[PDB]
Amino acid sequence: VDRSLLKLKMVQVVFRHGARSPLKPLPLEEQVEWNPQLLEVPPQTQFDYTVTNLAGGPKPTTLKGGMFAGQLTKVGMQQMFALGERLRKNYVEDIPFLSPTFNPQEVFIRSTNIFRNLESTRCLLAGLFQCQKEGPIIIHTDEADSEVLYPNYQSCWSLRQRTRGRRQTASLQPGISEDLKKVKDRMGIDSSDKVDFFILLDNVAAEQAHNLPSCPMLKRFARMIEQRAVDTSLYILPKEDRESLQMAVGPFLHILESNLLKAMRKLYLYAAHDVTFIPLLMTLGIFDHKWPPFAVDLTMELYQHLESKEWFVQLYYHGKEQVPRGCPDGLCPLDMFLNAMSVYTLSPEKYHALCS
């Protein structure tokens, strides 16, 4: 189709928080030091916000070195800022789709209620709007028990049940087991369980992102660690199991879809997690078999053709053009896109029904 004839209607972004300290420190005798000066907020990122419920509405440990676990750092803040700036290039500079200043009317913001995602959202907005707002910044969040921004095992009974055996046996799978044993052995950490590939990956990725001197045997195995984390995660929620993927990412897809249809707000922002991205990318047919990186984004553009009145979407992941289920390279007709993803989508009512 002829791009000059297309008008940008809506943009949706799903993103992961930036570089941060690990959630749980590894059981190591010698540990890397995390300097609190990494928590310094660069002035270009300082944007104040209010957290609310979905309405809304009233809102719903220490590492060596004196820094808290799972905390976005100055490094992560700069990544998220950079993400904001790329969006500004496309939706502010290249075309005047969004006002250069934050407008509550133009933008809807949602995040899981966890500090690292809230601060990442703050930094993204700071870059996108260059710290300029025409009104209060509201970040909408839901209570953990209702949250759909990650697969919710606690609140969805059937999902917990369907994955139970695979959750148990994921780490005993061929090649995963032998490799976990190899790493722990070499690290001198073995028998420390529970330490699985997710905890190893969490640590190596956080240290690498910060240029910190990881344990050498941990670094030796960094690639295997990421790969096996991915294989573990895929084994638990395989492409072949439709109902599980539905209960895992279905409601979130339903939200994304609903936004497209309403557009038939300029921008929707969703701060999500790596465990959200893996199944989301798989249902979209775009998974690259890599652990979703810090600050990674999934961007959706919705256009309408001025002559024909037809609607098209373009999908990007990590700045790269993607081809989803049901779509040709380039602009994908909205019906083709939505019809393909309909297999994975779950209305809130069907979701609630399926979960019990």
Curated annotation (Swiss-Prot):
Keywords linked to the UniProt accession: Hydrolase, Lipid metabolism, Mitochondrion, Phospholipid metabolism, Transit peptide
EC numbers, comma separated: 3.1.3.2
Location (main, coarse): mitochondrion
A GO BP entry: phospholipid metabolic process
Active site residues according to the UniProt entry: 17 (nucleophile), 274 (proton donor)
Catalytic activity: a phosphate monoester + H2O = an alcohol + phosphate; 1-(9Z-octadecenoyl)-sn-glycero-3-phosphate + H2O = 1-(9Z-octadecenoyl)-sn-glycerol + phosphate
Enzyme class, broadest EC rank: hydrolase
Keyword Cytoplasm: no
Induction: Induced with the differentiation from myoblast to myotube.
Region: Substrate binding, residue numbers: 16-116
Resulting phenotype, residue 237 to W: Decreases activity toward substrates with medium and long aliphatic chains, but not toward substrates with short aliphatic chains
Record note on what altering residue 20 to A does: Abolishes enzyme activity
Compartments, as annotated in UniProt: Mitochondrion
GO molecular function: acid phosphatase activity; lysophosphatidic acid phosphatase activity
Cellular component, GO annotation: cytoplasm; mitochondrial matrix; mitochondrion
Result, substituting residue 205 to W: Abolishes enzyme activity by interfering with water access to the active site cavity
Result, substituting residue 274 to A: Abolishes enzyme activity
DNA-binding as UniProt keyword: no
Tissue: Highly expressed in kidney, heart, small intestine, muscle, liver, prostate, testis, ovary and weakly expressed in thymus and colon.
Oligomer and partners: Monomer.
Function, in words: Hydrolyzes lysophosphatidic acid (LPA) containing a medium length fatty acid chain to the corresponding monoacylglycerol. Has highest activity with lysophosphatidic acid containing myristate (C14:0), monounsaturated oleate (C18:1) or palmitate (C16:0), and lower activity with C18:0 and C6:0 lysophosphatidic acid.
Family, per entry: Belongs to the histidine acid phosphatase family.
Listed name of the protein: Lysophosphatidic acid phosphatase type 6
Species for this entry: Homo sapiens
